[PDB]
Ligand binder design. Structure first.
Ligand SMILES: [Cl-]
Ligand SMILES: [Cl-]
Ligand SMILES: [N+]
Ligand SMILES: [N+]
Ligand SMILES: [N+]
Ligand SMILES: [N+]
Ligand SMILES: [N+]
Ligand SMILES: [N+]
Ligand SMILES: [N+]
Ligand SMILES: [N+]
Ligand SMILES: [N+]
Ligand SMILES: [N+]
Ligand SMILES: [N+]
Ligand SMILES: [N+]
Ligand SMILES: [N+]
Ligand SMILES: [N+]
Ligand SMILES: [N+]
Ligand SMILES: [N+]
Ligand SMILES: [N+]
Ligand SMILES: [N+]
Ligand SMILES: [N+]
Ligand SMILES: [N+]
Ligand SMILES: [N+]
Ligand SMILES: [N+]
Ligand SMILES: [N+]
Ligand SMILES: [N+]
Ligand SMILES: [N+]
Ligand SMILES: [N+]
Ligand SMILES: [N+]
Ligand SMILES: [N+]
Ligand SMILES: [N+]
Ligand SMILES: [N+]
Ligand SMILES: [N+]
Ligand SMILES: [N+]
Ligand SMILES: [N+]
Ligand SMILES: [N+]
Ligand SMILES: [N+]
Ligand SMILES: [N+]
Ligand SMILES: [N+]
Ligand SMILES: [N+]
Ligand SMILES: [N+]
Ligand SMILES: [N+]
Ligand SMILES: [N+]
Ligand SMILES: [N+]
Ligand SMILES: [N+]
Ligand SMILES: [N+]
Ligand SMILES: [N+]
Ligand SMILES: [N+]
Ligand SMILES: [N+]
Ligand SMILES: [N+]
Ligand SMILES: [N+]
Ligand SMILES: [N+]
Lengths: 10, 144
């Protein structure tokens, strides 16, 4: 699909 | 992503075309989000050669989710006798997570690449260890 990555912790 | 015949033409200037085509098909038939691309590769010393790379994403499991992690694998014209040069390619919405396998430029470092030897080592085996290593420690994170 589209590139994706886990969200960085804030 | 491209036909066997077009792949053969892309690697027309390669020293071992049948071997490079076969190992590449063995990956892109399973990993449909990787596509062969002919582009100018710049060596660390600033010289350059037109090389085939695989550009796209590989599926990586992490905490019960599956990410499409963007990579680029460059094949030298001596493939398969020298390892590919491999990068994580963050999008504008991503940042690289550095560690023992990934530097701040996104270059990948693995025992698989250091110990590379045809025919024990191949492109599919490299993708498989990349998926295991990135599932342990994802090499890119998106915006918080
Ligand atoms: Cl982008
Ligand atoms: Cl970055
Ligand atoms: N993402
Ligand atoms: N995490
Ligand atoms: N997170
Ligand atoms: N955080
Ligand atoms: N392969
Ligand atoms: N893929
Ligand atoms: N796939
Ligand atoms: N291409
Ligand atoms: N250079
Ligand atoms: N990519
Ligand atoms: N990509
Ligand atoms: N993917
Ligand atoms: N998965
Ligand atoms: N995980
Ligand atoms: N994982
Ligand atoms: N996740
Ligand atoms: N998943
Ligand atoms: N790259
Ligand atoms: N090369
Ligand atoms: N090698
Ligand atoms: N290499
Ligand atoms: N290579
Ligand atoms: N690499
Ligand atoms: N990138
Ligand atoms: N990319
Ligand atoms: N990218
Ligand atoms: N790493
Ligand atoms: N990491
Ligand atoms: N680098
Ligand atoms: N990169
Ligand atoms: N490496
Ligand atoms: N490396
Ligand atoms: N490894
Ligand atoms: N390792
Ligand atoms: N490895
Ligand atoms: N290897
Ligand atoms: N390995
Ligand atoms: N290996
Ligand atoms: N083996
Ligand atoms: N994994
Ligand atoms: N893993
Ligand atoms: N894992
Ligand atoms: N993990
Ligand atoms: N890692
Ligand atoms: N990493
Ligand atoms: N990693
Ligand atoms: N993001
Ligand atoms: N995100
Ligand atoms: N990020
Ligand atoms: N986050």
């Amino acid at each position: 699909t589209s590139p994706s990555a886990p969200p960085l912790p804030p | 992503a491209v036909s066997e015949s077009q792949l053969k033409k892309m690697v027309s200037k390669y020293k071992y075309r049948d071997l490079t085509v076969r190992e590449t098909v063995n990956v892109i038939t399973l990993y449909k989000d990787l596509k062969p691309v002919l582009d100018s590769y710049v060596f660390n010393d600033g010289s350059s050669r037109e090389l085939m790379n695989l550009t796209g994403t590989i599926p990586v499991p992490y905490r019960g989710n599956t990410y499409n992690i963007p990579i680029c694998l460059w094949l030298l014209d001596t493939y398969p006798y020298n390892p590919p040069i491999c990068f994580v390619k963050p999008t504008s919405s991503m940042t690289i997570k550095t560690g023992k396998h990934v530097d701040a430029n996104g270059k990948i470092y693995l025992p698989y690449l250091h110990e590379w030897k045809h025919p024990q080592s191949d492109l599919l085996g490299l993708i498989q260890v990349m998926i295991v290593v990135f599932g342990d420690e994802p090499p890119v994170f998106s915006r918080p």
